[PDB]
């Protein structure tokens, strides 16, 4: 059985603050970064 | 980094990309800390309207004049 994923918001703020809105990686790559951050795999 | 470069040994078949590992890691971490220190935001303030009353505050209530269809003529 699983629970709710706990993630400190500074990591997600680093994910999005790595670059400006223009000249950011494409949204598939940023989605895989956010999903691997919120993935509950040990 | 100077203590590492002056006292650490290496197997002598060691690439420069793994000989400068502490420098690479320290530079990346230190650039991240620099951009956090530069992206520290400024202090919030009260945003005032033209009156001197803060914005987003409701004004006084006044009954808006609205023309209604008088229903006494559906006869």
């Amino acid at each position: 059985d699983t629970h709710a994923v706990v993630v400190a918001p500074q990591r997600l703020a680093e994910i999005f603050n790595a670059a400006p809105a223009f000249a950011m990686p494409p949204i598939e790559d940023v989605f895989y970064q956010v999903a691997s951050l919120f993935s509950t795999k040990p | 980094s100077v203590r590492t470069d002056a006292f650490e040994d290496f197997p002598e078949n060691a690439d420069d990309e793994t000989r400068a590992a502490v420098g690479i890691q320290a530079r990346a971490k230190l650039e991240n800390n620099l951009r956090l220190l530069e992206g520290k935001p400024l202090n919030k303030g009260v945003a005032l309207g033209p009156n001197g009353i803060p914005v987003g505050m409701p004004a006084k209530w006044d009954v808006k004049e609205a023309r209604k269809y008088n229903i006494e003529a559906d006869g």
Binding site: - | S1, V2, R3, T4, D5, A6, F7, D16, R19, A20, A21, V22, G23, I24, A26, R27, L30
Partner: protein, 53 residues
């Protein structure tokens, strides 16, 4: 000719600094690293210094 020799001396200083101290050269660069080695006297004489020094 003096300027050309000074330019190749700067390139030599960069190559010798990447040979001696690759970590510090990756941190700050060869010229400032050479200035620190110069003031302290040697590499193992700079290494005995605290960070506040």
């Amino acid at each position: 000719e003096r300027s050309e020799y000074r330019r190749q001396l700067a390139e030599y200083l960069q190559n010798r600094m990447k040979a001696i101290s690759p970590n510090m050269t990756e941190l700050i660069g060869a010229l400032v690293g050479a200035r620190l080695i110069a003031h302290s006297g040697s590499l193992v004489n700079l290494a005995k210094n605290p960070g506040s020094t």
